[PDB]
Design a binder for these strands. Structure first.
Ligand SMILES: [Mg+2]
Ligand SMILES: [Mg+2]
Ligand SMILES: [Mg+2]
Ligand SMILES: [Mg+2]
Ligand SMILES: [Mg+2]
Ligand SMILES: [Mg+2]
Ligand SMILES: [Mg+2]
Lengths: 79, 99, 127, 100, 114, 107
RNA sequence: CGGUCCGGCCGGGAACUCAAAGGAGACUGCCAGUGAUAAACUGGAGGAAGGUGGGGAUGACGUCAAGUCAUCAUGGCCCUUACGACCAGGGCUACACACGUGCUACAAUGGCGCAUACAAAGAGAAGCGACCUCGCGAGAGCAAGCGGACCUCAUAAAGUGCGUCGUAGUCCGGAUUGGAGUCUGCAACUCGACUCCAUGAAGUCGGAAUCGCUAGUAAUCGUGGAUCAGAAUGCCACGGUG
């Protein structure tokens, strides 16, 4: 979908990656960036992805690299 | 050299009034002009709704006619240039000069 | 001596240049068989030169712009009839009888408001 | 529309010529240059810190007299309703009902 | 004539008969016949066994069999076992890439029943 | 039609044969305004009827026309073309040639 | 007509096509028959056009509690640290169904491949963007011309010529899905367009019912524009065949 010259990631979430790797793993990180591309330096962390009203924690897995964080947060409740 | 005057206006009966005043002045002062040529009129067409609500079928049909006139002057005689450059023309006529 | 006649159609425009003596047809620097892909379009220009006999008797030098297959062919057919009336001036009674000198002025009907086409209305419900 | 909605549109245009007129124009070229900085131009990350409302895609062309966002015309800068009212009273030169 | 693609092609022209293999369309069949040197309008008659096994060598570069069925399937298994949003669309028989689900979703949903 | 009683339009005849009746026959088979492909089928069908199914091409069509009989000629030509499309042969020129062969021998 | 590097391209030519300012021309004007000698109708000539030539604008009094408190007129009161305002994300695009409106189909009047001919009308400066080069391609890079009868979008498509498939769920039809990409834009997960590869649903002409249309119409073929950063099977226009 996106062009190959640079996978997109927000600046506020990229700063949250830097402190989490150095200072060790923490509580699940609340964010709103549903459009960021998962990089390999995030594997192991838990990021709470906002889905419209709440935050769902997503345990990052090795095969999640390349996809979006919005692909792990259902936006509507179905019954 | 050669100077040309591109004339454009919204009215067809008004664009030839300002055109004839230039050509008659040019022939009187001794200039060589190959007449005025009728260029094709670029007419726009506007079709918009008349109602702000339902009954889509009733509409309005507008147009804007922009006629074009070109006068080619062969010789840059100083008597020709000084008269034509500050003529009193109609307000609805836009002039374009190529020196 | 040149003999000229203007014939046109919907969006075509054809000139006709007559010169005395050949069976030559040159359309847009091409031949009659080369330019016309349709066999019907080859024969509709032969229709005005049917009552008046041409075999190898007069040149025709024609060009045409705009239109299509039969739009150009109808433009040539009108242009030849005005050239023969220029050529002889007594042939008119045969040309009025054929019906070829009448300019077909059936232009396209405009696309109307509220309809997808000139007369075709979008589909209608009873109730 | 509402007066608060048109105040948003003036706020977007005032930031558009401010930020994204010349600065984002440079940052788009640096990402586009094939000759130099094929890997580490980093102009995209600097574009992220800029405010969003300078974007030309976010602004909405609306009627200058009423504020209607629907039926805009770039010829007059007005909505389709106000084109009729100026034409019937002779406020727009040359605009009249057509027939063809 | 039996290829590594064990299913037997019909006795017709070459570019049509290679289409019967799962994973070889019309364009890829043009690429095999151009790389081999066989004309596209040649039937299975006079297509000798020295010309069949050189088509086996060209098709050997691509995985086109039930082995291709599992790799399309396990790629979807990567989505469904991960728990992603796109993995949920395949499990419930729903369209994935943005098609509407009000009406006209009859391919994904299956035949209608009130 | 209630008050407006007018005639019917008189189209130009067949350019190849000079036949007024054959010009209305090609317009029935013509779909989407494709005159060039419609007359190509009809000319190819009648040459099958002429060369291998009986000479006098203009008279051979009339014998097939006579058995299935302005409107009487119009309903006759329409029944030939519509029945030719629902056949088992390969092309439209071959199907309409067999229909004129059957209509000449009234079957 | 001279000039050939075969291009109106360059001297030129002002003829013609085209371009648009004005005017002529169709007015039952003329003839014959019918009709109460009337209006009118019928027939014919002339004429490019003949009986309101073709099309548009042009829509009475009234019917629809139709549309506009958002063109305004007549507003009066409520909310007012909120019924207001700012921002992030989501939703307007959901999904067991129903209804109306469209597109592409179910094919040899066709599919595909090669060669190739003919449009009209528009749009273009924070724009249209050629040439050259690269990629199967969507495009990318380089870079003229052009506020435009100059330049660009832009090679119109059906058609034509040959070859092929041979009546079948097919070289029909393209849905859906996977993988790999392009472009727009802070940003294409929810929810963009397009291209490449692969997959090849239903469908073999459609019940009761129901719609459009009396001629350049129907049918069909493509093109352009408005909206628009981008996003048309909708809508507005334009022609081709007929
Ligand atoms: Mg926008
Ligand atoms: Mg295959
Ligand atoms: Mg009511
Ligand atoms: Mg009321
Ligand atoms: Mg207000
Ligand atoms: Mg197909
Ligand atoms: Mg009627």
């Amino acid at each position: 979908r996106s062009l190959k010259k640079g996978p997109f990631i927000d600046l506020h979430l990229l700063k949250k990656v830097e402190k989490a790797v150095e200072s060790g793993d923490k509580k699940p990180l609340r964010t709103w960036s549903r459009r960021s591309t998962i990089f390999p330096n995030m594997i192991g962390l838990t990021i709470a992805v906002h889905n419209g009203r709440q935050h769902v924690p997503v345990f990052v897995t090795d095969e999640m690299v390349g996809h979006k964080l919005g692909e792990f947060a259902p936006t509507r409740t179905y019954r | 050299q050669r100077i040309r005057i591109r004339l454009k206006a919204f009215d067809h009966r008004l664009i030839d009034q300002a055109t004839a005043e230039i050509v008659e002045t040019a022939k009187r002062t001794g200039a060589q002009v190959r007449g005025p040529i009728p260029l094709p009129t670029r007419k726009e067409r506007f079709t918009v709704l008349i109602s702000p609500h339902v009954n889509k079928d009733a509409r309005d049909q507008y147009e804007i006619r922009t006629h074009l006139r070109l006068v080619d002057i062969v010789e840059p005689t100083e008597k020709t240039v000084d008269a034509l450059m500050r003529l009193d023309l109609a307000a609805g006529v836009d002039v374009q000069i190529s020196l | 001596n040149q003999y000229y006649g203007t014939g046109r159609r919907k969006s075509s425009a054809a000139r006709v240049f007559i010169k005395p003596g050949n069976g030559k047809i040159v359309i847009n620097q091409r031949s009659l068989e080369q330019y016309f892909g349709r066999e019907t379009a080859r024969m509709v220009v032969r229709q005005p030169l049917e009552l008046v006999d041409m075999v190898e008797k007069l040149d025709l030098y024609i060009t045409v712009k705009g239109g299509g297959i039969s739009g150009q062919a109808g433009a040539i057919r009108h242009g030849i009839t005005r050239a023969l009336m220029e050529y002889d001036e007594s042939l008119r009674s045969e040309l009025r009888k054929a019906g070829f000198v009448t300019r077909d002025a059936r232009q396209v009907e405009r696309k109307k408001v509220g309809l997808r086409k000139a007369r075709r209305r979008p589909q209608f419900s009873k109730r | 529309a509402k007066q608060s909605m048109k105040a948003r549109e003036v706020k977007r245009v005032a930031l558009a010529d401010k930020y994204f007129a010349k600065r984002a124009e440079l940052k788009a070229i640096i990402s586009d240059v094939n000759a130099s900085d094929e890997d580490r131009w980093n102009a995209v990350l600097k574009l992220q810190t800029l405010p969003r409302d300078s974007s030309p895609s976010r602004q909405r062309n609306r009627c200058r007299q009423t504020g209607r966002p629907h039926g805009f015309l770039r010829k007059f800068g007005l909505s389709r309703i106000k084109v009729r009212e100026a034409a019937m009273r002779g406020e727009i030169p040359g605009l009249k009902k057509a027939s063809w | 004539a039996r290829i590594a693609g064990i299913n037997i092609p019909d006795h017709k022209h070459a570019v049509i008969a290679l289409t019967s293999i799962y994973g070889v369309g019309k364009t890829r069949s043009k690429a095999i016949l151009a790389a081999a040197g066989i004309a596209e309008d040649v039937k299975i008659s006079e297509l000798s066994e020295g010309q069949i096994d050189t088509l086996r060598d060209e098709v050997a570069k691509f995985v086109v069999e039930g082995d291709l069925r599992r790799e399309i399937s396990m790629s979807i298994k990567r989505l469904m076992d991960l728990g992603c949003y796109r993995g949920l669309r395949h499990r419930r028989g729903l369209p994935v890439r943005g098609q509407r689900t009000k009406t006209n979703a009859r391919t994904r949903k299956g035949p209608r029943k009130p | 039609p209630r008050r407006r009683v007018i005639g019917q339009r008189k189209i130009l005849p067949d350019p190849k044969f000079g036949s007024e009746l054959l010009a209305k026959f090609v317009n029935i088979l013509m779909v989407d305004g494709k005159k060039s492909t419609a007359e190509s089928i009809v000319y190819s069908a009648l040459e099958t009827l002429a060369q291998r199914s009986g000479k006098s091409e203009l008279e051979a069509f009339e014998v097939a026309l006579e058995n299935v009989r302005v409107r009487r000629n119009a309903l006759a030509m329409r029944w030939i073309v519509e029945a030719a499309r629902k056949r088992g042969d390969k092309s439209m020129a071959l199907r309409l040639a067999n229909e004129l062969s059957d209509a000449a021998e009234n079957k």
